[PDB]
Structure 1
Amino acid sequence: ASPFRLASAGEISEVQGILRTAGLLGPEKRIAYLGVLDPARGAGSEAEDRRFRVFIHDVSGARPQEVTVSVTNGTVISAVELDTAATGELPVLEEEFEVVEQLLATDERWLKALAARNLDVSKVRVAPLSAGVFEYAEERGRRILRGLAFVQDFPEDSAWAHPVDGLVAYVDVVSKEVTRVIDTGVFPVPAEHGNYTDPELTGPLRTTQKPISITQPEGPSFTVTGGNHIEWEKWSLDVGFDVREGVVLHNIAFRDGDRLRPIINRASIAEMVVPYGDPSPIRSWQNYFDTGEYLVGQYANSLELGCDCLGDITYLSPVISDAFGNPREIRNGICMHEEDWGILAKHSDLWSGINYTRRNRRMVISFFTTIGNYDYGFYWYLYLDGTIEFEAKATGVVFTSAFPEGGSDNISQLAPGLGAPFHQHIFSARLDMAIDGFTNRVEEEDVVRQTMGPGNERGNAFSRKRTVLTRESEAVREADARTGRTWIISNPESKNRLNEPVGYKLHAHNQPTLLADPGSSIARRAAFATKDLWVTRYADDERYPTGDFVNQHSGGAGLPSYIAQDRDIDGQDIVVWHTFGLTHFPRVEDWPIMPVDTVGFKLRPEGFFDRSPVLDVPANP
């Protein structure tokens, strides 16, 4: 029984039973997060202990708890009451998404704002938005959501077309109180609709697309065993799923001859945040931590064959817990397939007369999630040649506002009266490395330009410089695209046949990092997003760059606190945290539903193998 298997329905029910028997899950309790924990280092042999961690909210105002249970042993390992003003509020609950609109609908100040604008309260949707930490002292220790209004002209209307600017409200979702209603002035509510299935807006659908059929007549080249263990074209790994992170990859390894060589022990997107750059007080507080506050795995879509996932698809249907501890399956939530990837290697040699061509392929593991207006696909790719890549596909409907009279330095115009505030989508990939095993180190590699002179008389030479990051105090790094900066993770105790350390090189896209002022709340709460690359010493409790309880947690925790331990990372069990994001100045083409745009990173073997690992690929049939 692989200790990396997906949680089963019965395991979640067992958690529920253990919590109930221990007095921790009475009728006032709600599970805000539940997930299996990874096996401890060295546990492999033997005796598994499947532990689950749970964040338990209390709707009656009692303090929430963080609990770890052993489903194997039927026990509570630890249970701690949380002081949310200190360590953060629990993630937003799916049940709280309707509460903001419902509380506002009977509030006299909200009704007064809507009546001034001649808006029928029954048609006003309220986006349930994370609050962050600003100047409102009454919010400390309370579970707050903020609400922005959007008009639905009819039940199938896209409300995003009709933002109600100049108005925001704040709500206490436990006491069921509206704390503040701020109305700074009326703005026209944009009139056009954004209904991308309405023939009046789409026009006649094109009839020019002829079918494309992708099939595998002998089925796929990968196998799935033990529920979630993949073997494909020398790669071995396990596909996990966590309600916060989504798809997680474990034990990524490559079979090089007769040895199973580890590469990455755990790969995940450990945080993703959407900071907004509109200084209007209506939105200047808006920073949506899709992963840490909302939990991206929870909202994973069920992916339909042909439409969402094309080709010969193998699905996983991961199980999560509902708010009461009952298991719920996400049907078809994870898509797995292999696909052709063009030319792998080709050479036509005049002298030998040999013409050689081989094709590449990649294995794809993906899920797609929806967070309000946003929809994101998360894709991991494994290539025949050893490259590993992650790509995010961002789509959905842009978050809208009014477009001010006279224009805006911080908002794009989409349609008459309709704006879209500038924002970024910034990800953190947590890569618990295991290059040839756990003894690893990181070097920053820059290209080196050389001056024409002695030893370089024609002025053509160039070189490279590698700097070992020896301790966490030295391991907070920025991009330098101009100098071709990359980061190499190597195993200083494992040499290839040329007597050089085996490694993998991280190639970033070098997109802008967090733009907010360094003194802002978001720069403190999302400090990870201010730098491209961080290296920490592995510690089982250091899971997220933002810490455990992101919602309404005041800055500081996460990676800057972890790094302060100044641990040795020079030939040790280490974790690379790569920040990468999209800076989005919305364009007209993004309206009324946005075409996908992408961001990501890749790692390529760098002296990991003794020669090309794809010499045994056969000629295409």
Structure 2
Amino acid sequence: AAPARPAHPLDPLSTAEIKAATNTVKSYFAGKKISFNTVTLREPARKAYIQWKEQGGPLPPRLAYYVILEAGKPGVKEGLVDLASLSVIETRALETVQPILTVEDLCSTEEVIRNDPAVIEQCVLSGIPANEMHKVYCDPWTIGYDERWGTGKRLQQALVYYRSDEDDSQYSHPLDFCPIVDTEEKKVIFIDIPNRRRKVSKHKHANFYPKHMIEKVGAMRPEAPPINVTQPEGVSFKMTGNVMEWSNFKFHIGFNYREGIVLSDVSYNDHGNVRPIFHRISLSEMIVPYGSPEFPHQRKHALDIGEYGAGYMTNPLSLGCDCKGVIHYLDAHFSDRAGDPITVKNAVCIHEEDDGLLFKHSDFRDNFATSLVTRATKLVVSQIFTAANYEYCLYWVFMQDGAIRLDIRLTGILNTYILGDDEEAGPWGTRVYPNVNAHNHQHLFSLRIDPRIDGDGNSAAACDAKSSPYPLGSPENMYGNAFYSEKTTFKTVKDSLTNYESATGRSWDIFNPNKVNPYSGKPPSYKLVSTQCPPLLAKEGSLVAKRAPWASHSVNVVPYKDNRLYPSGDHVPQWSGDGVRGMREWIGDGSENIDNTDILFFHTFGITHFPAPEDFPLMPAEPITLMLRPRHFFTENPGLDIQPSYAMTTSEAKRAV
């Protein structure tokens, strides 16, 4: 009667497992009116997984984690189902939190506002007649946090816009007011109205489809000639279910409602010696804090991962458009509020691409006739998600020097608020179009690394480039040129709380202090090379800083414990930021050991964005990247057994003349 076991313990729940879980929960709560918010894999404990994979150990139980609401009860209930026995094995009621906002939760808000008499009244005061409510739209946001209601009601705020025609881009025409909606009652409970009213813009909409551009600039550019990419003999990667093998890497590609892509059990086959690198790597939280202090714009600091979910938000991807070439896709499966499985087709795309030169060297002695050149190929595992106005394109990239990179491209549309005719947008925003204020904001991400560098028992350090402390003209530093790398190994959590520093070109190592490279004498490591590391601009004690305690440092290293995934806590919406949970709980008093143990390394990276008119009405892609590169992991360049694109030795060159 139980669902079939998966091919691999880290595989996401199948649609059958989802329905089995929600049947089990409905039965457990029979006679209660409940709705499903989350039904997802509860991954095996790290010890249990490693013991199963590498030690012939017990098969970990297949478990689903659920979150439900119950009509007329505050907060949520959450728990675990054991799928093999179709039973609820753990359950608890959390009356004072609110959970992630699903697509269904968000979907109904527009019609609630269009039909609400107070909202209609504000639209009419703003210059939109009462019988034109079909032209009023809103983007349904998390309320984020509002101290007037805490978590006592489940709330959204509606950022309201106007379209003259359904095909317009509405973001040139924000309205001035902000309805607050009770998600479960489907009712507006309050409208924040500014002391200074600003009526709807009379300008044309700032549009971007070809029909609009033809009107606006006369004509489109002609179709460019095509650039065609083919792989007539197929690809070099091999997938077995969700397990990838490519260029000596092996790893499991997972996916969930919240993080989106989760890469697990990542190893590199070093000439027959299969060496672990990471147990798990993913994006674990975000925050996108805006920088206008005016009310109610403090409530714009979406933690998109915890409040909406990079999986729930993810686009179905298309062949030729989003990622071109020969592509392997994976689907994603979630539950809807009724407990039925839902599918997002082609949620992940996997492909391999040309990546320019891997390495080259030529000898000047025979005018470069002696020459070796080897081209690089990269493997890319990608998704794209839409958070209302913005699109986040995520690319996990594996490379043939053994490095792993995460590239992000931000696109979509600026968040916009209305600007009066004579109103100055600065210093907190930019007038990107008439009557349009695009507020300053940051995009910050929390990369969660559970490392196993060359096996278990790891540490982390900051590496700072420093001049020698001996002065110019000393016997020790006669010409003043000496410099070295100062490695500060983190002994306790408090030591790890560190920022990027340009002054020392700071990087961070994650290494195995139990092992030694036989050439260099240093421990094997992967080094985080990451410079897009903004300070958190919101102050200490701010709503933003309190709700995202991870974001105030570029690096936070804590001891591993099971279920330490989400650093702003498990249920993010409407938390005030007060209390010991998430990263604040894991840091504790800062005194716990993190040298030579099981650690978790959370890195904060991202951008700070001051809008300009180039970003409007649709923003060109803005890049973010970080890299984890092997240093002292190998004893020589690991790509040298890749066949060169061209090689001629000195003796060969001599024979050719």
TM-score scaled by length of structure 1:
0.95
Q: What is the 5 A alignment of 1:149-164?
A: 149-164=160-175
Residue 358 of structure 2 corresponds to: 344
In structure 2, the partner of 1:456 is 477
Choose 571-580 or 114-123, whichever is displaced more: 114-123
Q: CA deviation at 1:19?
A: 1.2
1:97 shift after superposition: 2.0
Give the aligned partner of residue 497 of structure 1. Answer: 518
Aligned counterpart for 1:514 among listed residues 536, 541, 546: 536
| Alignment-derived partner of residue 621 in structure 2 | 596
Report what 1:617 is aligned to: 642
Tell me which of 178, 181, 198 is aligned to 1:171.
Answer: 181
Q: Amino acid of the residue matched to residue 520 of structure 1?
A: S
Which string of whole-angstrom CA distances, capped at 9 and with x for unpartnered residues, describes residues 268-327 of structure 1?
100012111112214222111110001110121111111111111111112222222222
Work out whether 1:474 is the aligned partner of 2:505.
Answer: no
Matched, 1:430 2:460: no
d(CA) in 2 for partners of 1:159 and 1:49? 49
1:314-353 matches, within 5 Å, as: 314-350=328-364
2:4 corresponds in structure 1 to none
- Determine whether 1:201 maps to 2:216: yes
- The letter for the 1-side match of 2:231 is Q
Q: CA deviation at 1:502?
A: 0.6
Q: Cα distance 1:285–1:219, how it changes in 2: closer, same or farther (>3 A)? A: same
- Corresponding residue for 1:235? 249
Q: 2:61 aligns with which of 49, 69, 84?
A: 49
Aligned position for 1:22: 28
Structure 1 residues 126-275: aligned runs within 5 Å: 126-136=138-148, 138-165=149-176, 167-184=177-194, 185-190=196-201, 191-197=203-209, 198=212, 199-201=214-216, 203-207=218-222, 209-225=224-240, 227-275=241-289
Which of the residues 370, 373, 383 maps onto 2:399? 383
The aligned amino acid for 2:511 is: S
SS in 2 for 1:297: coil
Unaligned runs of 5+ in 2: 1-6, 647-657
Residues 202/558 of structure 1: CA separation in 2 closer, same or farther (3 Å cut): farther
Report what 1:277 is aligned to. Answer: 291
Separation of aligned partners in 2, 1:323 and 1:449: 60
Aligned match for 2:604, one of 566, 579, 586: 579
- 8 Å CA contact 1:447–1:484 kept in 2: the answer is yes
**TM-score, normalization: structure 2?**
0.90
- Worse-superposed segment, 177-186 or 253-262: 177-186
Runs of 4+ in 1 over 6 A off after TM superposition: none
CA distance in 2: counterparts of 1:316 and 1:75, whole angstroms = 29
Partner of 1:492: helix, strand, or coil?
coil
Taking a change above 3 Å as real, the CA distance of residues 344 and 204 of structure 1, as seen in their structure-2 partners, is: same
| Contact 1:438–1:572 (Cα < 8 Å) also in 2 | yes
Preserved contact between residue 150 and residue 576 of structure 2 (Cα < 8 Å): no
2:79 alignment partner AA = V
1:67 partnered with 2:79 = yes
Q: How big is the shift at 1:464?
A: 1.1
- Shift of the 238–201 alpha-carbon distance from structure 1 to 2, 3 Å rule, reads farther
Deviation, structure 1 residue 104: 3.0
Offset at 1:183?
1.9
Moved more, 10-19 or 89-98: 89-98
Q: CA RMSD in A?
A: 1.8
Structure 1 distance, partners of 2:180, 2:142, is 10
TM-aligned CA distance change 1:140 to 1:39, over 3 Å: closer
Q: How far off its partner does 1:27 sit?
A: 7.0
CA distance in 1, matches of 2:37, 2:450: 26
Asked if 2 retains the 8 angstrom alpha-carbon contact of 1:357 and 1:619, the reply is yes
Aligned residues: 614
Determine the structure 1 residue equivalent to 2:556: 534
Q: CA deviation at 1:83?
A: 1.9
Task: Give the distance between the partners of 2:47 and 2:113, measured in 1 at CA.
Answer: 53
Distance (whole Å) between structure 1 residues aligned to residue 74 and residue 483 of structure 2: 65
1:439 is aligned to 2:457: yes
3-state DSSP of counterpart to 1:16 = helix
Residue pair 2:533, 2:604 contacting (<8 A) in 1 also: no
Residue by residue over 1:324-373, the C-alpha shift from the partner in whole angstroms, topping out at 9 and shown as x without a partner, is 22222211111000111111111102358631111111100000011111
CA offset digits 1:356-397 (Å, max 9, x no partner)? 111111100000011111111111000000111101111111
What residue identity is the alignment partner of 1:9? Answer: T
Instruction: Kindly indicate whether the alpha-carbon contact (under 8 Å) linking 1:33 and 1:244 is maintained by their aligned counterparts in 2.
Output: no
- Give the Å deviation of 1:482: 1.8
SS at match of 1:42: helix
Q: Provide the C-alpha distance between the structure 2 equivalents of 1:485 and 1:443, rounded to a whole number of angstroms.
A: 10
Q: Residue in 2 aligned with 1:544?
A: 566
- 1:37: Cα distance to partner? 2.0
Q: Provide the residue aligned with 1:608 in structure 2.
A: 633
State the match for 1:559 in structure 2.
Answer: 583
Pairwise CA distance, 1:511: 3.2
The aligned residue for residue 33 of structure 1 is 38
The equivalent residue for 2:595 is 570
Which residue of 374, 397, 406 maps to 2:413? 397
Check if 1:360 corresponds to 2:371. Answer: no
Gap runs ≥5 in structure 1: none
Q: Write the deviation string for residues 447-502 of structure 1: whole angstroms up to 9, x where unpaired.
A: 11123122111111111110110111222111112201111011011222224211
